[PDB]
Symmetry: C2
Subunit: 122 residues, 2 copies
């Protein structure tokens, strides 16, 4: 099953990085700039994993993740370029499977996605 990942990230640079990282794993990558685009994609395509920025114009990413979790149990990892404990624990608490801070090893990211996808993609 070709894993499908959705990246919710408004910064073009960060989003292109992430996207090329996962295309290199053989994933199909979908992109979203905000919460409307996120729900649009989640409605119309199969999505096995969401990577979301906590920090995000419009509705914040914690809130988007809360909403996501009310509707779906899809695998979810948060991103932050701010190491900040409260945001880390909150995001885990609302049900993110992982929390990754800048700067990250791409390898850590794709191995964590692979292990998580191995458990959730049934």
């Amino acid at each position: 099953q070709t894993p499908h990942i959705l990246i919710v990230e408004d910064e073009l640079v960060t989003r292109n990085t992430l996207k090329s990282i996962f295309e290199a794993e053989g994933y199909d990558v979908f992109e979203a700039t905000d919460g409307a685009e996120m729900h649009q994609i989640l409605s119309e395509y199969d999505i096995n994993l969401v990577i979301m920025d906590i920090n995000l114009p419009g509705k914040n990413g914690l809130l988007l993740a809360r909403e996501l979790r009310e509707q779906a149990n899809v695998a979810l990892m948060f991103l932050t370029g701010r190491d900040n404990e409260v945001d880390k624990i909150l995001g885990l608490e609302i049900g993110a499977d992982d929390y990754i801070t800048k700067p990250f090893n791409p390898r850590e990211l794709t191995i964590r996605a692979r292990n998580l996808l191995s458990r959730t993609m049934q």
Copy 2:
């Protein structure tokens, strides 16, 4: 079923901390000191989550985890007394669901355990 946690840790203080952190969550905690004791408890009881240190007496935790991963897919987290990028990536590569490093926030640890347990139990 109540969550059963196996902690594989030869450092008595560390193992006692982890054990209290998980007891304070109403889990049943099992204790091992090395691979031999670990394998026994995995035969005797039913284990939902293994938390394992890398440096043990005898075979290191990476090897124990590597071998374990050949037999079973149980939820697995590594402990380490140091940040070290290579051990962290090997640990995840061989199949650990998480990799945690001292000093640990117990909150992060129990929330990660709960989220992971929700997926595996």
